[PDB]
Design a protein around this ligand. Sequence first.
Ligand SMILES: OC[C@H]1O[C@@H](O[C@H]2[C@H](O)[C@@H](O)[C@H](O[C@H]3[C@H](O)[C@@H](O)[C@H](O)O[C@@H]3CO)O[C@@H]2CO)[C@H](O)[C@@H](O)[C@@H]1O
Ligand SMILES: OC[C@H]1O[C@@H](O[C@H]2[C@H](O)[C@@H](O)[C@H](O)O[C@@H]2CO)[C@H](O)[C@@H](O)[C@@H]1O
Ligand SMILES: [Cl-]
Ligand SMILES: [Cl-]
Ligand SMILES: [Cu+2]
Length: 235
Amino acid sequence: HTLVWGVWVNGVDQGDGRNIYIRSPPNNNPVKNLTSPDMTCNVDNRVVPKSVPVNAGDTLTFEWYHNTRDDDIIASSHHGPIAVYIAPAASNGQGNVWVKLFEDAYNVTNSTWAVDRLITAHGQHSVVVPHVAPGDYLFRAEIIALHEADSLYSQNPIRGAQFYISCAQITINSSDDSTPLPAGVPFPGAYTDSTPGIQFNIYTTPATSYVAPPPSVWSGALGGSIAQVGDASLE
Ligand SMILES: OC[C@H]1O[C@@H](O[C@H]2[C@H](O)[C@@H](O)[C@H](O[C@H]3[C@H](O)[C@@H](O)[C@H](O)O[C@@H]3CO)O[C@@H]2CO)[C@H](O)[C@@H](O)[C@@H]1O
Ligand SMILES: OC[C@H]1O[C@@H](O[C@H]2[C@H](O)[C@@H](O)[C@H](O)O[C@@H]2CO)[C@H](O)[C@@H](O)[C@@H]1O
Ligand SMILES: [Cl-]
Ligand SMILES: [Cl-]
Ligand SMILES: [Cu+2]
């Protein structure tokens, strides 16, 4: 159970974005039905009044929280991967539009899941804004908690992979468009009951064997991190 509080741009806090530049759901409960319209941008997908200005190459940091800002972030049980996708905002997230900018699943070097590192990072993970066409975008940050993913939700709706999905409204101002955004995948649709990484038993299957759900990270993506970029406590 986790939500996005706001974003930072080049280590500058853009302030509380909830229902302002984040298409916030009413609560921190997961989405679990892979064919739900809620897979796009969670249960309250609508235009919110603001979009955060960035330029291509800026560091864009998502900041998550559990109940209050800079708390436990997400229950430690919720091991799993983190992904960020981008779509042009005029799509409203519909159609074959979501392009993956970031994936971090299980780090063999550190012996840690992305969610474990997200907690240590005070809820912060970042992407480099890609060199796409200037305009309005949705950045869809997705945490998959796998602690009940040994079952398919479609088998047992009390369990299943849990999707913590948050869509931020981002406006890309200065961009040379050196990597034009291609068509992408649909949400709902890209993940199905047979997709690798959706049904996974963390109690019996080694995390060294985990394969995150496709699609692969786009060739135009410039990278990211899971690391504290701003100190919320200094405010
Ligand atoms: O036993 C089932 C799994 O429970 C996980 O804890 C979650 C609780 O089941 C869930 O009820 C709770 O929901 C809270 C939420 O955390 C809080 O922010 C909100 O204000 O109220 C909700 C309703 O009470 O969330 C927790 C996760 O934080 C365990 O983490 C898991 O190990 C266990 O299998
Ligand atoms: O961040 C580690 C993560 O990498 C995933 O592979 C990606 C990689 O992030 C990206 O830089 C490159 O451009 O594409 C590949 C393929 O999608 C990998 O799937 C994860 O297991 C791993 O934790
Ligand atoms: Cl939960
Ligand atoms: Cl959310
Ligand atoms: Cu939870």
